[PDB]
Amino acid sequence: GEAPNQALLRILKETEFKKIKVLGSGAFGTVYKGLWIPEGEKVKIPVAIKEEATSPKANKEILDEAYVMASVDNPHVCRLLGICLTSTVQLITQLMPFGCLLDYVREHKDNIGSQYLLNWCVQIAKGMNYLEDRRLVHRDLAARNVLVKTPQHVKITDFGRAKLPIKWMALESILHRIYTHQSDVWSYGVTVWELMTFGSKPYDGIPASEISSILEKGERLPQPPICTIDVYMIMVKCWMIDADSRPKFRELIIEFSKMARDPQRYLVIQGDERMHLPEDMDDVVDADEYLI
Ligand SMILES: */C=C\C(=O)Nc1cccc(Nc2nc(Nc3ccc(N4CCN(C(C)=O)CC4)cc3OC)ncc2C(F)(F)F)c1
């Protein structure tokens, strides 16, 4: 009983963009930094291009991600700019210059303040709440799949596995392949734990075959050193077995937004107050100001 998806899918000519560098590499496909110029529009857009050789099942994976990226518009979700129909189909999205958030809290852990951490949790809940409003389920929410546009502004990404990573899975998901927005709240909880530990690996050492039994006993990830019981309690609530008991993303916005209004009451970071995080570029425009 759903509404017609009238999102526009833009096909871009290979001539419209230049690849400047390789950002990330796999045999399946590689990600490039690059610039894109709409043909008649006199702008330059910093983009990231995802692309190697193609099994017939390979192209069906990238197109589902493009279908999902093209139907979302939210300040905290990565937006598709278009696709290019060269022999290996290219997905073209907005360049998130500071890279992936997991890598970012590791590289800068000694300059990351409680106000940023609480803002990222707010921005991520907003993204996920937008996804729940649009009746979507991520299935792979993790700090590795949140990208950093500025240090003030993160966006959720990786919709390849989206529908309508065992250490980020919900227990119901691990036992019975069940996936909900509430199962997404679980991985939200694990995602916040990664940030509060500056990128620590959850259940480090423990093999994934062991994860299902542990969680049944009642064990959970431990309270991060910087976390007041308020923040840690919210994580723990995301990890209830009864999924109706986990919080909704709209409540996580409210709660973490309440805490982002006085961040040092809720995260205790040594020296928290002192820390601060940052051709021709004349016709340059960020994707977020390029509207169609
Ligand atoms: C959590 C790991 C991860 O997702 N890493 C990653 C690596 C490559 C591409 C993407 N996807 C992506 N990336 C950007 N922006 C981006 C990522 C990484 C860098 N780095 C780190 C590594 N590096 C070298 C030389 O070793 C170069 C700098 C830089 C940038 O942007 C300048 N933007 C968008 C995506 C997207 F998700 F694919 F759209 C993720």
Author numbering: 696 to 746, 749 to 861, 877 to 990, 1005 to 1018
Sentences reproduced from the published study:
Activating mutations in the kinase domain of epidermal growth factor receptor (EGFR) are one of the major causes of NSCLCs, among which the most frequently seen mutations are the single site mutation leading to a leucine-to-arginine substitution at residue 858 (L858R) in exon 21, and the deletion mutation in exon 19 resulting in loss of the pentapeptide ELREA (delE746-A750). In this study we determined the crystal structures of EGFR T790M or L858R in complex with the third-generation drug CO-1686, which provide insights into why CO-1686 displays preference towards the EGFR T790M drug-resistant mutation while sparing the wild-type EGFR.
We therefore determined the complex crystal structures of EGFR T790M/CO-1686 and EGFR L858R/CO-1686. The overall structures of these two complexes are highly similar to each other. The binding modes of CO-1686 to EGFR T790M and L858R are essentially the same and EGFR mutant proteins adopt the “DFG-in/C-helix in” active conformation. As expected, CO-1686 covalently binds to EGFR through Cys797 in both structures. In the T790M/CO-1686 and L858R/CO-1686 complex crystal structures, the anilinopyrimidine core of CO-1686 form two hydrogen bonds with Met793 amide and carbonyl in the hinge of the kinase. In the determined EGFR T790M/CO-1686 and L858R/CO-1686 complex crystal structures, multiple hydrophobic interactions were found to facilitate the binding of the compound to EGFR. The pyrimidine core of the compound forms a hydrophobic interaction with Leu844 primarily; the methoxybenzene moiety forms a hydrophobic interaction with Leu718; while the linker phenyl ring carrying the acrylamide warhead of the compound into proximity to the thiol of Cys797 forms hydrophobic interactions with both Leu718 and Val726 side-chains.
